[PDB]
A paper describes a structure:
Cry11Aa and Cry11Ba are the two most potent toxins produced by mosquitocidal Bacillus thuringiensis subsp. israelensis and jegathesan, respectively. Cyt1Aa, Cry11Aa, and co-crystallized Cry4Aa and Cry4Ba. These are produced during sporulation and are remarkably stable in a variety of conditions, but dissolve after ingestion under the high alkaline pH levels characteristic of the larval mosquito midgut. Solubilized protoxins are activated by insect gut proteases enabling binding to gut cell membranes, subsequent oligomerization, and ultimately gut cell lysis leading to larval death. Cry11Aa and Cry11Ba structures maintain the three-domain organization characteristic of Cry δ-endotoxins.
Y449 in Cry11Aa, corresponding to Y453 in Cry11Ba. Y449 is not involved in direct H-bonding to other protein residues but supports a large H-bond network that interconnects waters and residues from facing monomers in the dimer. Furthermore, the two facing Y449 engage in edge-to-edge aromatic-dimer36 interactions (centers of the rings are 5.5 Å apart, and the angle between them is 88°). Nonetheless, the mutation was detrimental to the protein stability and resulted in the growth of crystals of different size and shape, likely owing to destabilization of the H-bond network at the dimer interface. To evaluate the significance of these changes, we characterized the distribution in size of crystals of Cry11Aa-WT, Y449F, F17Y and E583Q using AFM. All three mutants had a significantly reduced volume compared to WT Cry11Aa, due to a reduced thickness of the crystals. The structures of the other three mutants were determined, using the WT structure as a molecular replacement model for the phasing of diffraction data.
Residue numbers in the entry:
A (entry chain A): 13 to 352, 357 to 643
B (entry chain A): 298 to 352, 357 to 396
C (entry chain A): 397 to 643
D (entry chain A): 298 to 347
The structure:
């Protein structure tokens, strides 16, 4: 026997919980420090968390976890090299951190140690950028840059205390504004290289690599992108994708132009129904039984009809599917023979699974069993969603495959077209208006997306409810109320979200609205500010406009000049109060709108997320305009 | 709305089992998949059951070959054969 | 069957010669070509067939029919430029509701031929808001200082606490033109806005994203309201002669 | 991408035209519409152009 044992998210032994990985305390302290930064003290905590007790043991734990996840191990020589680099960094950081804590230390000595540490980090960084092993080192790299980006940050805050002149502080601000972009570019380079390479052989391997990066890489990139401020909230909304089925090669231009769009579906709607096209046949005698998954159809909004079949919903060749007012549910043909008795069955049915009473599935059990027969691969399938057994295999017992993650819930169920070209309808597959479907004879795969629990409230109330206790709120762009036409979904995982909106409408206007509600006890007199993250490659003469619409009490909050820049930019509005907007605890049609005029042919612009933070809690510490 | 119906498609009498002179009067075909004598066996019955769903009445389509051998006393003495007609929109259905 | 569209022979009959059937009307042009489902029940997907978002189709084995719609020539400019161009010489402008730039979801088409149009918009959205926008452009020589007024024809059977709102949106220069109390009345009503000028709206001869918006809040289950058409007339040329409130 | 192909499906030799002893070796079927001897004629060729 090869393996009769159960599986856990396709792995032979249970995986570590997403909140119990080795980089979790680092991320937690980073999120804590983003809200309130303890000057000349945060670098010490980051050093104690990355190198506990001046030991590289936590980094080795991270390396082992990543190697276990992505099925790529390193050689002992590379391990020794990385450990030597760790030891050098640890020596220099020990010198610096020890000299800091002496009451009455010399500022010039601290300046020298700071310069030595920054130089050593910059010098040893390229050791983690060898592409031949990047798929692993991209994790370790992510930590090192952090240790650097923290250091410089602290150096900018503690000015003359560490022996820095004003020119030194300005040079450090310039170096920080340069490195916060260079490190992100290099990280994205490694990620895109390895992701495309792994997708060109099988979509499952690329999905696994992406799931690893969503936990060990991208949250820290977002943290970097939020370190220049003080008061915003560090929150990730990336999803984990479980793939069960055969291997399908996918190009990188085909991932962001079709496959990801088919996986996401209605990006702001809750899954309400899922349908499968099941086929079973044991026609001959020497040829064993077999099963096929012909198509998957997810139904989110029952009144929109945007999502279509991924695969096919056909059940016969008699062109009878919607006639007589009913829907064909199952077609079974039983054949009997006679030789001087073994009835054969051919079944083609449509399995339907509606959403549970609690609106969402918590876990699943989906598995496929392969069988070789004269260089021909036959399949058997087992499907169970939550507590409803959807399909038990007729070809024999199949071991389970527990698909679950503590702190996540099932939000989307889709598939990938198998045996067809994935290069068509790229420019047609938009967010709305168009039909989201793709014809294919079979799929033979099921893809389940788990979303974190911080998104469970939006997909249940269709709005964003504000509380008084919290100080900062992050709103992803994909969690909108309505969006304009000719809008696309752009996978931007470095933003710690499931994607961004690409506006490319050449008529009327490009507008995106978000629904806001207020809980009881909310203080309507407290001052707030809005921060909008956008990317405007082409110049827009009318700029970007942030507006508040409340039952006709439309008020203009901000008008920002849209200049050409290929990098992400944050627009900050002036202060305001919820009494100026006319919003109370009973307002149900309150909306925030981000709008711009029509574009030209070949032009587009990107919207990432929104930040709502109180005025007292928000402060810019490192100016971005000083390059 | 269209009621049930039955059809007699062919009759095949077999006298001398080793001569093979008599053939089908009508047709012995049971499907359009060209499968009748493959795999060494003879197709005896093909049943298709269709299920629908409207916000349950399974339909059946049966095509089989009924076989009756000669009795122990070599000959049949009597029989009971009958057909029932039914009109439906100028269409005659049979049982 | 014999089919010919304009000058392109689409299908000549193989079963023999068929006499012609000249489909033409002086002053009209072909705008829509459709058919009717034959041999199937026509009672399904009524609540699903909306103006947008949904798929506009119906499965049927055959149709055996072709239906051609001729529209008058006064609509030829809109279906060619996707906007309404305003001139200085004319004093009054009528804009049907179906000639919009964009419309909200859960909106239906209501055949109201007594309004001398091809139909009216029925809003029945129970979330966000019900909004309808119309694109306006100005020809050269248009006087931007002349005063104008807006008249909105609506039918509001159920009470709307927030009422109806007419607004002018021009590249962010959004200005509120009118806020009208929506009381329950099963008959058609005209709301007249206050006077305004195109300089107050910031619209010139080069504005390409100028829009007029008619909006209202979300409705309740089983509620809807109808919009028929819009009237743009100069202030000097408009006068109410028979008061409608004196019943 | 799949090149052209040809198949020999059946051979039928006819010796004595009035005996009918020899039959098809293979198959004489040409379609799945069960039309071969209807209308008094014999189906000679079925061509489908796509």
């Amino acid at each position: 026997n090869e393996t009769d044992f159960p599986l856990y998210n396709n792995y032979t032994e249970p995986t570590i919980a997403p909140a119990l990985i080795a980089v979790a305390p680092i991320a937690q302290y980073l999120a804590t420090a983003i809200g309130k930064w303890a000057a000349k003290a945060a670098f010490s905590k980051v050093l104690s968390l990355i190198f506990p007790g001046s030991q590289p043991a936590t980094m080795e734990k991270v390396r082992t976890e990543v190697e276990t996840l992505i099925n790529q191990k390193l050689s002992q020589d590379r391990v020794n090299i990385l450990n030597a680099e760790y030891r050098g960094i640890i020596e220099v950081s020990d010198v610096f951190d020890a000299y800091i804590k002496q009451p009455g230390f010399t500022p010039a000595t601290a300046k020298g140690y700071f310069l030595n540490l920054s130089g050593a980090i910059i010098q040893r960084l390229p050791q983690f950028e060898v592409q031949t092993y990047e798929g692993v080192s991209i994790a370790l790299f992510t930590q090192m840059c952090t240790l650097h980006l923290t250091l410089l940050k602290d150096g900018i805050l503690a000015g003359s205390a560490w022996g820095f002149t004003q020119a030194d502080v300005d040079s450090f601000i310039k170096l920080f504004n340069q490195k916060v972009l260079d490190y992100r570019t290099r990280l994205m380079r490694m990620y895109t290289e390895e992701f495309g390479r792994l997708c060109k052989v099988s979509l499952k391997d690329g999905l696994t690599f992406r799931n690893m990066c969503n936990l060990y890489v991208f949250p820290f990139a977002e943290a970097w992108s939020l370190m220049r401020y003080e008061g915003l909230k560090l929150q990730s909304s990336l999803s984990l994708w479980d793939y069960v089925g055969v291997s399908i090669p996918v190009n990188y231009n085909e991932w962001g132009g079709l496959v990801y769009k088919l996986l996401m579906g209605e990006v702001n709607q809750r899954l309400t129904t899922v349908k499968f096209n099941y086929s079973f046949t044991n026609e001959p005698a020497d040829i064993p039984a077999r099963e096929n998954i012909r198509g998957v159809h997810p139904i989110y909004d029952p009144s929109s009809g945007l999502t279509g079949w991924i695969g096919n919903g056909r059940t016969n060749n008699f062109n009878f599917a919607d006639n007589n007012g009913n829907e064909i549910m199952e077609v079974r043909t039983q054949t009997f023979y006679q030789n001087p008795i073994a009835p054969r069955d051919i079944i083609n049915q449509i399995l339907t699974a509606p959403a549970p009473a609690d609106l969402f599935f918590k876990n699943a059990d989906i598995n496929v069993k392969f069988t070789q027969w004269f260089q021909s691969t036959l399949y058997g399938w087992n499907i169970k969603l939550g507590t409803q057994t959807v399909l038990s295999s007729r070809t024999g017992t199949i071991p389970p495959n527990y698909l679950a993650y503590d702190g996540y819930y099932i939000r989307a169920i889709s598939a990938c077209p198998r045996g067809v070209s994935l290069a068509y309808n790229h420019d047609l597959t938009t967010l709305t208006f168009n039909r989201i479907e793709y014809d294919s004879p079979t799929t033979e795969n099921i893809i389940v997306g788990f979303a974190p629990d911080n998104t469970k409230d939006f997909y249940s109330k269709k709005s964003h409810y504000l509380s008084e206790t919290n100080d900062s709120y992050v709103i992803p762009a994909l969690q909108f109320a309505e969006v304009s036409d000719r809008s696309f979904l752009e996978d931007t995982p470095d933003q710690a979200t499931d994607g961004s909106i690409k506006f490319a409408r050449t008529f009327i206007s490009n507008e995106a609205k978000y629904s806001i509600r207020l809980n009881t006890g909310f203080n309507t007199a407290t001052r707030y500010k809005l921060i909008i993250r956008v990317r405007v490659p082409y110049r827009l003469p009318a700029g970007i406009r942030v507006q508040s619409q409340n039952s006709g009490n439309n008020r203009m909050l901000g008008s920002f000049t849209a200049n050409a820049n290929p990098e992400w930019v944050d627009f900050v509005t002036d202060a305001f109060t919820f009494n100026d907007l006319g919003i109370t605890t009973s307002s149900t049609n309150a909306l925030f709108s981000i709008s711009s005029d029509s574009l030209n042919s070949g032009e587009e612009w990107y919207l990432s997320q929104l930040f709502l933070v109180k005025e007292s809690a928000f402060t810019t510490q490192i100016n971005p305009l000083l390059k």
